[PDB]
Design a protein around this ligand. Structure first.
Ligand SMILES: CCCCCCCCCCCCCCCCCC(=O)OC[C@H](CO[C@@H]1O[C@H](CO[C@H]2O[C@H](CO)[C@H](O)[C@H](O)[C@H]2O)[C@H](O)[C@H](O)[C@H]1O)OC(=O)CCCCCCCCCCCCCCCCC
Ligand SMILES: CCCCCCCCCCCCCCCCCC(=O)OC[C@H](CO[C@@H]1O[C@H](CO[C@H]2O[C@H](CO)[C@H](O)[C@H](O)[C@H]2O)[C@H](O)[C@H](O)[C@H]1O)OC(=O)CCCCCCCCCCCCCCCCC
Ligand code: CLA
Ligand code: CLA
Ligand code: CLA
Ligand code: CLA
Ligand SMILES: CCCCCCCCCCCCCCCCCC(=O)OC[C@H](CO[C@@H]1O[C@H](CO)[C@H](O)[C@H](O)[C@H]1O)OC(=O)CCCCCCCCCCCCCCCCC
Ligand SMILES: CCCCCCCCCCCCCCCC(=O)OC[C@H](COP(=O)(O)OC[C@@H](O)CO)OC(=O)CCCCCCCCCCCCCCC
Ligand SMILES: CCCCCCCCCCCCCCCC(=O)OC[C@H](COP(=O)(O)OC[C@@H](O)CO)OC(=O)CCCCCCCCCCCCCCC
Ligand SMILES: CC1=C(/C=C/C(C)=C/C=C/C(C)=C/C=C/C=C(C)/C=C/C=C(C)/C=C/C2=C(C)CCCC2(C)C)C(C)(C)CCC1
Ligand SMILES: CC1=C(/C=C/C(C)=C/C=C/C(C)=C/C=C/C=C(C)/C=C/C=C(C)/C=C/C2=C(C)CCCC2(C)C)C(C)(C)CCC1
Ligand code: OEX
Ligand SMILES: [Cl-]
Lengths: 188, 238, 144, 49, 102, 51, 176, 449
């Protein structure tokens, strides 16, 4: 037995912020409270992954990769850093052909990414961050595009990166709050 | 046609709606000088360039003569509101290039035997040049279906199954290897335009066109036929 | 994928559609009524642009007998004119705002008459109503 | 467009996590048969018709 | 991952020894993270007819990974009886069905 | 090279002998294209017999 | 739970395409038809055994004569439908017989389905659709719907299989 | 009251005991009218007390307040609620009038005269007296015509009504030139009910509404005067059944047709039901979604005119079956939609490429986005979105509620008309209680084949 009485006539909710704090190996972030853990490892160095109960397109992932440089600026300019890590949005390697019947796409391209915003900022401690905001669109038009939020930094010789994905359909229906909260809470 | 640009602009949407007058190209007035007219040589901006077909002919693969066809998709086969550039030389040579606008419209017709022949009526990337009485050129014909189009069994080029889901026992299906591959490759066509009237007061031109291109192939699963399209066209120079 | 630089799209108004759908924000913010009241510069610029557009384009369309274009023009960019005039006149003293309201009502009646004549397709009546509307708009602009 | 009861993500634990239900299994089946009703007639994410 | 009895059609995914997905045959090829072309998977046969033969062509690798779902890859003669290509049932199933109905 | 009689047609030559050469399918017994087949085509005659 | 069971039977077994289930639904709907039509016909061919508009009080269970006009009912349904009952015993035995037979046929179908002996597909239609990329019927659309149902319900409906499916292997349509 | 002993009608059919009691029937009708006014007033008070200004009318589940907004009460330019007091005044007046009507009905039903054919000959009647029934019908026709004229006077002299197509945004206009052309009025009435035509639901300006109301008021007054001074002719006496239940069945059929028409008008109309107070319609949401996606993709550097979809038809712009330029996708079925925010971008031959390429306004974009997100889709427990969504939004469109409720009411009243017409025809003939055993009609006919 347990002996715990039921919370009858209780006027307080234990958690109402919609986020669940997480303490990891050298990083911390606020995971949305309606997301379940996932066992997928798509990118090298995955140490954390959560996906929404409703739609599996909405997810976040944290990568801790080994590098030689001790600072994020030594990996290149923010544009160059994003160009090097362009595999985070996937690749159209399985489609090997030529086409000219796509809606607003370059020839022989069935996918594209629009870099909506880049930013460089330092935290309260004094560690520089590279913040990105991309919208990747598909030839078919899955969910009307996907929003990618990336925040990368280097600490103790390791690169710490987080990518938060959210479908546009859910983005404009009110699910952007959870994604932005998880993106803005990444601390190393 | 049987209506001018001013006459068309003098109507209301509720008066044009349902009368099939939106699928037609305007004609010129009595002030239009025949031929090239009195156009000052130079490069103009093309606007409101439209082409209204008046006949479709189909030459099935294995035949040496074109055949009449009956349209099945109603009044949706007019290209309109295209923009580009037109250059006129002192001798009389003219060059036409199309950049933007509605320059494509899928069309389906039926032939004598009873076979439906879909085709992709377009003048995309039109590049013609020559004298006023004849302008030979070419254009690109994109694939009828996109890369993400899925066939009735869920097989597509950039999305879908790469084999037949139903026939599970056949591990490789070497007999169906031809139909399991989809390619949305593009082709080219040829055009032959002409100029019949021109009004330098308002910068308007008109004439006739004849184009030849190829029908669809169901993403590389058929032998396309040759289709000849002829009709009138209109445009404004400014 | 292949990167594209579209960082200047936000400066072109990329967030208008996303902000208009934000159910957390109030309805005034979503519809843009809150911003105009806070910043009267936008209202003044819209009023001036509407006046200039009315004059030039209405003259051109009535001259060439373009009724559909004229009506659409009368309600395409001028579509915020009533709200802008109300917002501008709400920042005036009692007598000044009363005179502004009277002038605005007269101008709106003139625009209604002009639209009726444009619908009925009377070239001379539409021209006279347009001249009257221009005079009334000038008067109400001078009043503000 | 006045559909039936929508008991999706109705049962929520103390920390906010979602506890599934037979209604959620039905929702999974509906999502399965929704994205495949017309494979090429849709160009935009919402089926408002 | 072997295809369960319930499913008439099953997706093709490749797992490592710890059960984590490493490769698959994608349905949406516009964006891929576990594609066989990206990973570079190859198949080698031990014993049997194809002993010592290694295939690295992505199409052949996909074709052989599709038949690994059914279990042990075999060679069939689909021309003697003009087999259509759908699984049948055995006397076990026929007997059980008939006698349950009876 | 593939005429009516090589395909084992029995009643079709009897219909054609009295002056019926067009079908609702658009073809003509001479290999040309049908021009306004009208009521009295092969299908029209068959339907009339059924009625 | 029963709703999930029904949807599972549709997605995996193609239960709607089973002739035994077709007989079962025919029997159930015919039984409902018979119930409604018999009630209406009896209630609208009554006899005048009282003076009040409330006709429920003009009956006595121990009476001898019947309370409604079988001749009138038979003539009405003969002139309206074409055929009609002329035997009360046969009428009521048919009423008993229809739903029982429907349910028994459905039971035989489910017994057959217990061993995955499902009438799932038409081989000729599958072969024709495979050879010709232009042939489409409603049966193929139902097949695609079943495939989607299976793929998207498998992960949560069967936790023991431990199916982890990347988002790019699940079948999906354009923009939806 | 009465009982089954002396009436023959059970308690579940007890209202049929006062078919021939004029005073009690009048009391029942007056009490029911009081109930209707009471519901109107109480619901108005309930809706006005639960209204917040930070959300639009259609987002708060209101159905009576948008009716007063369309009459020009407490609204401003653009469709923003400015004042609330008139709604309170209307609710209070309705509640007090309901009190008076309820007292009158209770009096006339409890202690009033039971049968007012001997003490009040002017008000007394017999169901089989055609002249008296025709006179009453004429009186009520005159009253209805006066009501229609009262509506007409509001749009002309007493401040006008809200016009969603007014230049420079929707605002409370004054209708000075109503359309009273016989060709215009007859065009709406004898129009097809199919797509494109829409019958009377397709009225697209307030001038036509006011002109039609002038027509209907004049017609009702003239018909009332005509019926007061005349009696039914031989061809009318030869075709109808003359009893109270028969008249009830006729009225039931008429109001069932009215209910179906009201459902369709609520679902489809935009003039008499402005989207500012009722939310977007069915087609409006799809058109808005396509418009906003076109705008967004154009802002990302794409050619909307020449963009090709997966099927090869056109992602953003395609051609209507008659030739007009319309939106692409599944919204090709909704190309008959016509709304105030979309008309300015439409030319004589459909949408104008240059207008939507260089002259799209932020207010239009905001309206499109708002009507896209607030689509008329929901669930029974008021969960917005499609059936495969989550519990995040508590919204169901006011158009959906009215449409569903009034379709249900119309169907049930059609069934009631069927029931009562059949019963009246049978009872007048004289065999509503069953068949006569002594003389059964079928036994006297020759047997069939
Ligand atoms: C004289 C006797 C009759 C003669 C004619 C009989 C013809 C019978 C043909 C056979 C088929 C049956 C009838 C089909 C009707 C289909 C109605 C339809 O497609 O649409 C209905 C139309 C709606 O029209 C719509 O009207 C719209 C109005 O347009 C405009 O509307 C606004 C105007 O400002 C906006 O601007 C808007 O954007 C703009 O589009 C559009 O035009 C649409 O395209 C158009 O479809 O409503 C209306 O006509 C108004 C209401 C009509 C009656 C009620 C319909 C519903 C009930 C059905 C019957 C009862 C069922 C229950 C009982 C069952 C047992 C008996
Ligand atoms: C005989 C009946 C036998 C069966 C009885 C079953 C139980 C019925 C009573 C309990 C109903 C109830 O608990 O009802 C609960 C609600 C009140 O609860 C509130 O209901 C609200 C409903 O949303 C509304 O309000 C929201 C918040 O503002 C949004 O604005 C939303 O858009 C709007 O729709 C919200 O959910 C609130 O959170 C919630 O507290 O009752 C209401 O609203 C009013 C209920 C009466 C309505 C009567 C008229 C119905 C007309 C439509 C008919 C459609 C056709 C039939 C369809 C089947
Ligand atoms: C819509 C409302 C409604 C109305 C207005 C009526 C009206 C009427 N009914 Mg019907 N009835 C209804 C619904 C209604 N009924 C329903 C739902 C049923 C099924 C249960 C019946 C079944 C029925 C039967 C079986 C009978 C009637 C009869 C009557 C009539 C006689 C009244 C009487 O004798 O009662 C006397 C009752 C009482 C003394 C109770 C008094 C309670 C009062 C009236 C309540 C209202 C007061 C309110 C709270 C405050 C108002 C005061 C004001 C200052 C605000 C009366 C005209 C009778 C008849 O046929 O007459 C010949 C009768 O036999 N009715
Ligand atoms: C519009 C006004 C209207 C009027 C004035 C009448 C009048 C009458 N009806 Mg009709 N009827 C109508 C519409 C109307 N009906 C509709 C819309 C239907 C639906 C099909 C019916 C179906 C109907 C039936 C089935 C019967 C009548 C009969 C009668 C009589 C007795 C009613 C009774 O005592 O109620 C007593 C009231 C009740 C027992 C309340 C029942 C509550 C319902 C079932 C649901 C609860 C409502 C909820 C909101 C949904 C009376 C002459 C009766 C008859 O004897 O005719 C001579 C009879 O048998 N009516
Ligand atoms: C010439 C005299 C006369 C007049 C003026 C009326 C007038 C009226 N009767 Mg009628 N009636 C008459 C004779 C008359 N009646 C006779 C002799 C009988 C036989 C007893 C009836 C039987 C009768 C009944 C049984 C009922 C009425 C009702 C009504 C009212 C319906 C309007 C309404 O619903 O508002 C809405 C419609 C409008 C157009 C808005 C008003 C616009 C103003 C009038 C302008 C209205 C006040 C109904 C009612 O409402 O009772 C309170 C009611 O139920 N009448
Ligand atoms: C409140 C509703 C109403 C009701 C219930 C009645 C009821 C009745 N009318 Mg009255 N009537 C009314 C209003 C009403 N009327 C109005 C407003 C007018 C003025 C036009 C008339 C003028 C009128 C005349 C001239 C006659 C009647 C007659 C009759 C009786 C015959 C029933 C019938 O219609 O035949 C069944 C219906 C038909 C065979 C078809 C009618 C449908 C019409 C033709 C549809 C098209 C409308 C018409 C062309 C009007 C112009 C359209 C409009 C835009 C202007 C019946 C008692 C007759 C009589 O007995 O008089 C004593 C008769 O001769 N009525
Ligand atoms: C009844 C018994 C009928 C017996 C056979 C009669 C003829 C059948 C074939 C005719 C036919 O199919 O026509 C078919 C044609 C149809 O005419 C046209 O045919 C075209 C075919 O491409 C069109 O498409 C249309 O089908 C149709 O408009 O009929 C006519 O033209 C009208 C003929 C009307 C004849 C009425 C009387 C017929 C019998 C008269 C008596 C015998 C002849 C005269 C003898 C005495 C002289 C002094
Ligand atoms: C919401 C649903 C409202 C309708 C309620 C049920 C009405 C009947 C359903 C379909 C029956 C088909 C015909 C079957 C048939 O022949 O019906 C006949 C049956 C008996 O007829 P009576 O002549 O005895 O009673 C009808 C009146 O004349 C009473 O005086 O009618 C009823 O009992 C009506 C009960 C209404 C109950 C209050 C409402
Ligand atoms: C203008 C008319 C508009 C409506 C026309 C309706 C036409 C349909 C009439 C069907 C009568 C067939 C009765 C056979 C058997 C027969 O002769 O019935 C006659 C039978 C005679 O009853 P008795 O009381 O005389 O039988 C005495 C006993 O001793 C029998 O052993 O009466 C019935 O059982 C009525 C039940 C009809 C059940 C109808 C079944 C539904 C039809 C199936 C449709 C299939 C379509 C396939 C298309 C590919
Ligand atoms: C005969 C009969 C019947 C019926 C009855 C009826 C139907 C009645 C009705 C009645 C009515 C229908 C009544 C009414 C009443 C009302 C009242 C009494 C009111 C009041 C009001 C008030 C008091 C108000 C107040 C206020 C104000 C002023 C302002 C704001 C606030 C408030 C709201 C508070 C029955 C069924 C039983 C059955 C038997 C017989
Ligand atoms: C306001 C308005 C309007 C107007 C309207 C009007 C003007 C209307 C009218 C209406 C009308 C004017 C109607 C009528 C109707 C009628 C009916 C519905 C009838 C019926 C009948 C019957 C049902 C009959 C029957 C019979 C027979 C057939 C045989 C013998 C026996 C008897 C007699 C029974 C409009 C739209 C412009 C716009 C919006 C608003
Ligand atoms: O068409 Mn037959 O299904 Ca009534 O939702 Mn939209 O549209 Mn189509 O999709 Mn889902
Ligand atoms: Cl769409």
């Amino acid at each position: 037995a347990y002996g715990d009485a039921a919370r009858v006539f209780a006027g307080n909710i234990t958690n109402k912020s919609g986020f669940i704090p997480y303490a990891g190996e050298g990083f911390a972030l606020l995971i949305p409270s309606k997301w379940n853990p996932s066992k997928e490892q798509d990118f090298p160095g995955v140490v954390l992954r959560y996906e929404d109960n409703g739609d599996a397109v909405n997810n976040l992932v944290v990568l801790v990769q080994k590098v030689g440089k001790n600072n994020i600026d030594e990996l290149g300019s923010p544009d160059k850093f994003l160009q090097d890590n362009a595999y985070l949005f996937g690749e159209s390697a399985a489609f090997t052909g030529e086409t000219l019947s796509e809606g607003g796409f370059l020839p022989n391209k069935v996918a594209a990414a629009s870099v909506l915003d880049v930013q460089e900022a330092t935290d309260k401690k004094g560690k520089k961050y590279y913040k990105y905001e991309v919208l990747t669109r598909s030839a078919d038009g899955d969910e009307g595009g996907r929003h990618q939020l990336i925040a990368a930094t280097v600490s103790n010789g390791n690169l710490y990166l987080i990518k938060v994905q959210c479908g546009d359909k859910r983005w404009f229906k009110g699910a952007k709050r959870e994604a932005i909260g998880a993106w803005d809470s990444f601390t190393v | 046609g049987n209506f001018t640009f001013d006459e068309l602009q003098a109507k209301s949407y509720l008066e044009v709606k349902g009368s099939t007058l939106a699928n037609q190209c305007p004609i010129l007035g009595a002030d239009a000088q025949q031929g090239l007219g009195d156009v000052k040589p130079g490069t103009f901006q093309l606007d409101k360039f439209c082409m209204e077909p008046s006949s479709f002919k189909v030459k099935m693969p294995g035949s040496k003569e074109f055949e009449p066809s009956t349209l099945l998709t109603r009044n949706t086969y007019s290209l309109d509101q295209m923009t580009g550039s037109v250059t006129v030389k002192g001798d009389g040579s003219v060059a036409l290039k199309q950049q933007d606008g509605i320059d494509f419209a899928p069309v389906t017709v039926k032939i004598r035997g009873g076979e439906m022949v879909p085709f992709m009526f377009t003048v995309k990337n039109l590049n013609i040049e020559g004298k006023a009485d004849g302008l030979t050129g070419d254009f690109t014909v994109p694939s009828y279906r996109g890369a993400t189009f899925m066939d009735p069994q869920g097989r597509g080029a950039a999305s879908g199954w790469e084999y037949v889901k139903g026939l599970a026992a056949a591990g490789a299906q070497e007999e169906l290897a031809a139909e399991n591959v989809k390619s949305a490759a593009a082709t080219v066509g040829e055009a032959a335009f002409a100029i019949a009237s021109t009004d330098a007061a308002t910068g308007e031109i008109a004439g006739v066109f004849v184009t030849r291109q190829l029908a669809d192939d169901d993403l590389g699963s058929k032998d396309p036929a040759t289709i000849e399209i002829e009709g009138i066209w209109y445009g404004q120079l400014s | 994928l292949d990167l594209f630089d579209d960082r200047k799209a936000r400066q072109a108004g990329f967030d208008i559609i996303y902000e208009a759908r934000d159910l957390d924000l109030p309805q005034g913010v979503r519809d843009g009524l809150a911003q105009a009241r806070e910043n009267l510069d936008v209202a003044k610029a819209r009023i001036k642009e509407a006046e200039k557009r009315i004059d030039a384009d209405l003259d051109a369309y009535i001259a060439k007998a373009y009724w559909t274009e004229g009506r659409n023009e009368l309600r395409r960019q001028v579509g915020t004119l009533r709200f802008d005039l109300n917002a501008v006149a709400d920042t005036l003293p009692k007598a000044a705002k009363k005179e502004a309201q009277a002038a605005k009502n007269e101008f709106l009646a003139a625009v209604e008459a002009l639209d009726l004549q444009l619908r009925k397709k009377n070239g001379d009546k539409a021209a006279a109503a347009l001249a009257d509307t221009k005079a009334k708009l000038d008067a109400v602009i001078a009043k503000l | 467009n006045l559909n039936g009861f929508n008991f999706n993500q109705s049962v929520v634990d103390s920390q906010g996590r979602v506890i599934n239900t037979w209604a959620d299994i039905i929702n999974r089946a509906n999502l399965g048969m929704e994205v495949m009703h017309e494979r090429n007639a849709h160009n935009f994410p919402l089926d408002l018709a | 991952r072997r295809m369960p009895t319930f499913f008439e059609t099953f997706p093709v995914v490749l797992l490592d020894k710890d059960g984590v997905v490493r490769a698959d045959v994608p349905f949406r090829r516009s964006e891929s993270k576990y594609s066989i072309e990206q990973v570079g998977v190859s198949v080698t046969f031990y014993g049997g007819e194809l002993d010592g033969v290694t295939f690295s062509d992505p199409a052949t690798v996909k074709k052989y990974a599709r038949r690994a779902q059914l279990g042990e890859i075999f060679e069939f003669d689909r021309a003697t009886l003009q087999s259509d290509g759908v699984f049948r049932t055995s006397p076990r199933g026929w007997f059980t069905f008939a006698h349950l109905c009876f | 090279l593939n005429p009516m009689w090589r395909q084992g047609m029995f009643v079709l030559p009897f219909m054609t002998r009295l002056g019926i050469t067009q079908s609702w399918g658009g073809w003509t017994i001479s290999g040309e294209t049908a021009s306004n087949p009208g009521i009295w085509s092969y299908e029209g005659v068959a339907a009339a017999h059924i009625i | 739970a029963i709703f999930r069971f029904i949807l599972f039977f549709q997605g995996f077994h193609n239960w709607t395409l089973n002739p035994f289930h077709m007989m079962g639904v025919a029997g159930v709907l015919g039984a409902a038809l018979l119930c409604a039509i018999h009630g209406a016909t009896v209630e609208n061919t009554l006899f005048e055994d009282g003076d009040g508009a409330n006709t429920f009080r003009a009956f006595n269970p121990t009476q001898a004569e019947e309370t409604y006009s079988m001749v009138t009912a038979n003539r009405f349904w003969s002139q309206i439908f074409g055929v009609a009952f002329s035997n009360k015993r046969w009428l009521h035995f048919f009423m008993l017989f229809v739903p029982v037979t429907g349910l028994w046929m459905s039971a035989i179908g489910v017994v057959g389905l217990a061993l995955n002996l499902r009438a799932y597909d038409f081989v000729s239609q599958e072969i024709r659709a495979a050879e010709d990329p232009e042939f489409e019927t409603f049966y193929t659309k139902n097949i695609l719907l079943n495939e989607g149902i299976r793929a998207w319900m498998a992960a949560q409906d069967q936790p023991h299989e431990k199916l982890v499916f990347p988002e790019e292997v699940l079948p999906r349509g354009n923009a939806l | 009251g009465r009982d089954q002993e002396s009436t023959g009608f059970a308690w579940w059919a007890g209202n049929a005991r006062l078919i021939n009691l004029s005073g009690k029937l009048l009391g029942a009708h007056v009490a029911h009218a009081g109930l209707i006014v009471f519901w109107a007033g109480a619901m108005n008070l309930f809706e006005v007390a639960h209204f917040v200004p930070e959300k639009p009318m259609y987002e708060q589940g209101l159905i009576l307040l948008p009716h007063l907004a369309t009459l020009g009460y407490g609204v401003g330019p653009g469709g923003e609620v400015i004042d609330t007091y008139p709604y309170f005044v209307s609710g209070v007046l309705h509640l007090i009038s309901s009190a008076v009507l309820g007292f009158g009905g209770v009096y006339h039903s409890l202690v009033g005269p039971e049968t007012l054919e001997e003490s009040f000959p002017f008000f007394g009647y017999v169901w089989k007296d055609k002249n008296k029934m025709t006179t009453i019908l004429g009186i009520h026709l005159i009253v209805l015509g006066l009501g229609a004229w009262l509506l007409v006077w509001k749009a002309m002299y007493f401040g006008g009504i809200y016009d969603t197509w007014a230049p420079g945004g929707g605002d409370v206009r004054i209708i000075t030139n109503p359309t009273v052309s016989p060709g215009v009025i007859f065009g709406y009435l004898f129009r097809s009910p199919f797509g494109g035509d829409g019958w009377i639901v397709s009225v697209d300006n307030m001038e036509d509404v006011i002109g039609g109301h002038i027509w209907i008021g004049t017609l009702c007054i003239f018909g009332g005067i005509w019926h007061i001074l005349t009696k039914p002719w031989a061809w009318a006496r030869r075709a109808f059944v003359w009893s109270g239940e028969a008249y009830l069945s006729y009225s039931l059929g008429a109001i069932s047709i009215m209910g179906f028409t009201a459902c369709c008008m609520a679902w489809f109309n935009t003039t008499a039901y402005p989207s500012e107070f009722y939310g977007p319609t069915g087609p409006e949401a799809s058109q808005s979604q396509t418009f906003t996606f076109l705008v967004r993709d154009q802002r990302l550097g794409a050619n909307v005119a020449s963009a090709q979809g997966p099927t090869g038809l056109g992602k953003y712009l395609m051609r209507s079956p008659t030739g007009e330029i319309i939106f692409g996708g599944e919204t090709m079925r909704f190309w008959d939609f016509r709304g105030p925010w979309l008309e300015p971008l439409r030319g004589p031959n459909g949408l104008d490429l240059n207008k939507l390429k260089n002259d799209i306004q932020p207010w239009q974009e905001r309206r499109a986005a708002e009507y896209m997100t607030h689509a008329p889709l929901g669930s029974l427990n008021s969960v917005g979105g499609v059936a495969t969504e989550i519990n995040a939004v508590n919204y169901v469109s006011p158009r959906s509620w009215l449409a569903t409720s009034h379709f249900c009411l119309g169907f049930f009243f059609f069934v009631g008309h069927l029931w009562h017409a059949g019963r009246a025809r049978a009872a007048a003939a004289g065999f509503e209680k069953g068949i006569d055993r002594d003389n059964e009609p079928v036994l006297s006919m020759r047997p069939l084949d």
